Amino acid sequence: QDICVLPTQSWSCNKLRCGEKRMANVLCSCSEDCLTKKDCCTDYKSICKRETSWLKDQCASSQCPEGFDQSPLILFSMDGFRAEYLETWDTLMPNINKLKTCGTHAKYMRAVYPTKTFVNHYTIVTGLYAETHGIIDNNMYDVKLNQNFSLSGSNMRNAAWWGGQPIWHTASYQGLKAATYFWPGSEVKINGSYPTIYKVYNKSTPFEARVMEVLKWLDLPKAKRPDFSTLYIEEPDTTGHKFGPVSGQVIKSLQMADRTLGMLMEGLKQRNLHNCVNLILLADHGMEAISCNRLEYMTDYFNTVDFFMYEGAAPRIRSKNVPKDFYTFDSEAIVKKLTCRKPKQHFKAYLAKDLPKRLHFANNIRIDKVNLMVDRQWLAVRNKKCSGGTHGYDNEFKSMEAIFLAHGPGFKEKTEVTSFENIEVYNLMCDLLKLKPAPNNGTHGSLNHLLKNPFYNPSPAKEQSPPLYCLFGPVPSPDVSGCKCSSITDLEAVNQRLNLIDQAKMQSEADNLPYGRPHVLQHSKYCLLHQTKYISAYSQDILMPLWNSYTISKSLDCLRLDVRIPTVQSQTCSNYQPDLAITPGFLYPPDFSSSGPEQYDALITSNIVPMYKEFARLWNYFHSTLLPKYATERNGLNVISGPIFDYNYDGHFDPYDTIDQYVNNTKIPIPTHYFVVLTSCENSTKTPLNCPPGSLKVLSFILPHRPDNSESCADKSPDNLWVEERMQTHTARVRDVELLTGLDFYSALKQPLSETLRLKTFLPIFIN
Numbered sequence: 001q002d003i004c005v006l007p008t009q010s011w012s013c014n015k016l017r018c019g020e021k022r023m024a025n026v027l028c029s030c031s032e033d034c035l036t037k038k039d040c041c042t043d044y045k046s047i048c049k050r051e052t053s054w055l056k057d058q059c060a061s062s063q064c065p066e067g068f069d070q071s072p073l074i075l076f077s078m079d080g081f082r083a084e085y086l087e088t089w090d091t092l093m094p095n096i097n098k099l100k101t102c103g104t105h106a107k108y109m110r111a112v113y114p115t116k117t118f119v120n121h122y123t124i125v126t127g128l129y130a131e132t133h134g135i136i137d138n139n140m141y142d143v144k145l146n147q148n149f150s151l152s153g154s155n156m157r158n159a160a161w162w163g164g165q166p167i168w169h170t171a172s173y174q175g176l177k178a179a180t181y182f183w184p185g186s187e188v189k190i191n192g193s194y195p196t197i198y199k200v201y202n203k204s205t206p207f208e209a210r211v212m213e214v215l216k217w218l219d220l221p222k223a224k225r226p227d228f229s230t231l232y233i234e235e236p237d238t239t240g241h242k243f244g245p246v247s248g249q250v251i252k253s254l255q256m257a258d259r260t261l262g263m264l265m266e267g268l269k270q271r272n273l274h275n276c277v278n279l280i281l282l283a284d285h286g287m288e289a290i291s292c293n294r295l296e297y298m299t300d301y302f303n304t305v306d307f308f309m310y311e312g313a314a315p316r317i318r319s320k321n322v323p324k325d326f327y328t329f330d331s332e333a334i335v336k337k338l339t340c341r342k343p344k345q346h347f348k349a350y351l352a353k354d355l356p357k358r359l360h361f362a363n364n365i366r367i368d369k370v371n372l373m374v375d376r377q378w379l380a381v382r383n384k385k386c387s388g389g390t391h392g393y394d395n396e397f398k399s400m401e402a403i404f405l406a407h408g409p410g411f412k413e414k415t416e417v418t419s420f421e422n423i424e425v426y427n428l429m430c431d432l433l434k435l436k437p438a439p440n441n442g443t444h445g446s447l448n449h450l451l452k453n454p455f456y457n458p459s460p461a462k463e464q465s466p467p468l469y470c471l472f473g474p475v476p477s478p479d480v481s482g483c484k485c486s487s488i489t490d491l492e493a494v495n496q497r498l499n500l501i502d503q504a505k506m507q508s509e510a511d512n513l514p515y516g517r518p519h520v521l522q523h524s525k526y527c528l529l530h531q532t533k534y535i536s537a538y539s540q541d542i543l544m545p546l547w548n549s550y551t552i553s554k555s556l557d558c559l560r561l562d563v564r565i566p567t568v569q570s571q572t573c574s575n576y577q578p579d580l581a582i583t584p585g586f587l588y589p590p591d592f593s594s595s596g597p598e599q600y601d602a603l604i605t606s607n608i609v610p611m612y613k614e615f616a617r618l619w620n621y622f623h624s625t626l627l628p629k630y631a632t633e634r635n636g637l638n639v640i641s642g643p644i645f646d647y648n649y650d651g652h653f654d655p656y657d658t659i660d661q662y663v664n665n666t667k668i669p670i671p672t673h674y675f676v677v678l679t680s681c682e683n684s685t686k687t688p689l690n691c692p693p694g695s696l697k698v699l700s701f702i703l704p705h706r707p708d709n710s711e712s713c714a715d716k717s718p719d720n721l722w723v724e725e726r727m728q729t730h731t732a733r734v735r736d737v738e739l740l741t742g743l744d745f746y747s748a749l750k751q752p753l754s755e756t757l758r759l760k761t762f763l764p765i766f767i768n
């Protein structure tokens with residue numbers, strides 16, 4: 001009859017099945033001579049030998065069978081499983097919801113740009129930004145190889161495409177075995193090797209069969225058994241693409257996912273591995289709803305479209321004739337004619353070096369230089385001629401956030417953790433495998449709060465240049481600076497306020513550097529300039545401060561030379577002219593001190609940096625009105641700001657012998673960006689200075705130092721209400737500023753180094 005011929009089509013066990021004896025055509029045995037031969041449905045002991053299912057159990061507290069001396073780690077990926085699915089539909093997914101309940105669960109996991117599967121899947125297993133491992137999109141063109149990249153093409157298995165070191169190679173190079181049941185890269189001969197066991201991708205393999213195979217790798221003899229295995233399924237990405245994120249169709253793809261995870265967990269409890277295996281359940285990206293009333297056509301911006309265009313949520317544009325006009329293609333011209341042509345364009349045009357530095361999406365020959373930052377739910381296509389959902393957007397968008405759930409003896413129990421970025425997962429996986437990670441872009445130790453016994457303890461970065469000294473001196477014999485200050489009558493007296501005694505310097509350090517001065521992790525000849533209201537590290541290598549830090553409380557033409565800075569290591573007033581695009585802007589705004597003698601502490605050559613006049617518009621307005629409002633909102637702020645030189649857009653500080661771009665007829669380098677880090681405290685009944693380091697709140701900006709405000713299309717507005725909106729898409733991690741400057745912040749905080757590392761990896765986000 002029917003319920004003893006479904007054994008050939010069903011991967012579960014019903015009650016009338018147990019004790020059935022061998023048929024040839026059974027996918028899964030439900031015999032009693034079953035276990036001994038290692039081939040039973042996960043629910044066998046749950047429904048027949050009346051044991052309690054894993055899902056019904058209570059979550060026991062802090063193991064493994066005999067041959068398992070180290071906990072195996074399973075990496076489970078459900079493509080396109082956006083974080084909101086778990087927030088809205090966990091009710092419908094009892095097994096996934098148990099993981100959330102008793103394992104370690106993050107609010108969401110940030111993907112990398114572009115938020116596509118091969119990009120993020122390889123990123124997860126290498127811990128590298130897409131710009132570095134090379135898989136920068138599912139479809140790419142490399143000019144050096146003159147080769148196309150595609151999932152349905154064959155060049156996808158050419159190892160020249162795949163950089164870095166995936167986790168499975170890391171596992172094998174240090175004595176463990178790894179088996180991947182589908183993972184982007186696992187079929188490629190990266191570094192001349194495969195995983196210890198891998199599976200040719202066949203999308204038609206049923207999810208249940210994949211779960212059975214992973215559970216049959218764990219039944220192998222100890223000498224052959226893999227220590228790390230991945231498991232991959234295409235839902236809810238496949239159905240999410242066709243029917244959209246809010247759909248009944250996705251709700252039952254999501255229940256199919258819950259079925260398969262539960263299958264895995266039931267089979268694990270059968271083997272007494274359920275409190276042994278370390279399980280990470282994540283996704284590569286999210287899902288966003290699209291429409292055809294939400295298409296942007298390049299024909300509405302060009303008359304002739306003689307360029308190739310990777311379309312969708314993350315578009316790029318290159319020449320149609322490659323490889324011969326690849327370097328010639330006028331990339332800036334396409335960006336400029338896509339710049340503020342209509343008042344309500346649902347995208348913005350960028351060259352790769354102008355992309356928000358937080359994305360880390362330049363510095364790869366495959367990253368074509370024309371790029372489009374498309375608004376959510378819209379797509380950018382070339383022509384006029386779509387439904388359901390897609391992905392690829394900016395990874396700040398709520399629809400792009402991925403789930404991250406962990407379970408096992410190596411993780412904490414029933415713990416909720418803050419958001420983190422998937423680039424952090426590679427390190428965390430080698431910790432659970434007791435492996436030394438290959439170099440990557442995670443901040444090793446920042447995910448330690450997830451682990452029950454952290455395997456790696458971070459140690460502070462060694463300072464690479466201690467400060468020199470710039471002592472107090474007389475005013476030079478002539479004043480060749482070209483600086484003039486009508487207002488000053490007793491020059492000797494006001495210059496004395498820059499000559500504080502040693503304890504007066506301490507008191508200011510206690511006020512303006514409450515977390516310790518930043519350590520310099522490059523080479524830099526610099527001194528420390530103490531004033532009562534601000535402290536700077538002035539570098540003779542770049543004729544300006546490396547950083548300027550000051551502290552403000554909730555509410556709050558004269559320029560001369562710094563007698564501590566030698567003339568040759570100085571900026572002078574005459575370096576800047578009124579028929580030049582660059583004007584001296586201030587790091588510490590003089591308007592913040594009370595005027596009279598305290599204001600003169602900020603009106604010196606040691607407190608100015610070269611600024612495009614239209615950037616100083618943005619810069620001054622932020623300090624003018626925006627910064628004092630954030631101060632009342634957050635109850636005071638510790639501010640630290642300075643220049644960034646990244647002319648080759650690698651995300652790292654430029655060494656000084658690399659800087660070519662000076663201002664006309666001088667030796668003053670033009671920064672590519674300026675950073676601003678604002679530290680307050682979550683519990684705002686406290687100030688930036690009396691806060692437990694564990695409740696610190698950080699907000700950091702890296703502003704593109706650009707000659708126009710084309711990005712905001714605000715070169716002819718009679719206001720500055722546009723500035724806050726553009727600054728809010730140029731936030732960054734403190735870590736991002738550290739990389740771009742060669743500085744190391746927050747060293748003197750009185751808390752474990754791993755806890756500070758969470759603060760530096762935090763990313764401020766404003767898209768609500």
Ligand SMILES: *[C@@H]1O[C@H](CO)[C@@H](O[C@@H]2O[C@H](CO)[C@@H](O[C@@H]3O[C@H](CO)[C@@H](O)[C@H](O)[C@@H]3O)[C@H](O)[C@H]2NC(C)=O)[C@H](O)[C@H]1NC(C)=O
Binds near residue numbers: 129132441
């Ligand atoms: C993300 O992590 C990776 C790995 O730690 C970083 O990649 C490393 O980047 C540096 C410079 O970008 C590379 O060194 C350079 O090698 C080139 C040869 O192509 C040479 O011309 C330079 O003088 C320099 O020595 C290094 O090879 C590279 N390592 C790997 C494994 O790719 C990357 O910089 C990190 N990204 C960020 C934003 O932190």
Ligand SMILES: COc1cc(-c2oc3cc(O)cc(O)c3c(=O)c2O)ccc1O
Binds near residue numbers: 151152184203234237
């Ligand atoms: C709708 O089609 C999909 C295809 C895939 C897909 O995944 C892969 C994973 C691999 O490790 C290797 C592959 O070749 C693929 C692949 O080709 C593929 O189409 C993924 C998600 C989908 O929604």
Ligand SMILES: *[C@@H]1O[C@H](CO)[C@@H](O)[C@H](O)[C@H]1NC(C)=O
Binds near residue numbers: 141308320
């Ligand atoms: C790669 O594919 C594009 C199609 O967009 C084509 O223009 C180009 O000539 C191809 N290059 C090679 C080397 O196949």
Ligand SMILES: *[C@@H]1O[C@H](CO)[C@@H](O)[C@H](O)[C@H]1NC(C)=O
Binds near residue numbers: 164165169191
């Ligand atoms: C490539 O393999 C060699 C050993 O054959 C190893 O020493 C090296 O670290 C590997 N390189 C990468 C980038 O994984």
Ligand SMILES: *[C@@H]1O[C@H](CO)[C@@H](O)[C@H](O)[C@H]1NC(C)=O
Binds near residue numbers: 203
């Ligand atoms: C793909 O998998 C299905 C089920 O596992 C199998 O029947 C089919 O033959 C496979 N196809 C290929 C081309 O391997």
Ligand SMILES: *[C@@H]1O[C@H](CO)[C@@H](O)[C@H](O)[C@H]1NC(C)=O
Binds near residue numbers: 684685
């Ligand atoms: C902030 O700290 C004070 C203790 O000084 C406490 O009374 C207050 O409840 C805290 N605010 C919180 C926990 O939100």
Ligand SMILES: [Ca+2]
Binds near residue numbers: 648655
């Ligand atoms: Ca650099």
Ligand SMILES: [Zn+2]
Binds near residue numbers: 080117
């Ligand atoms: Zn997809």
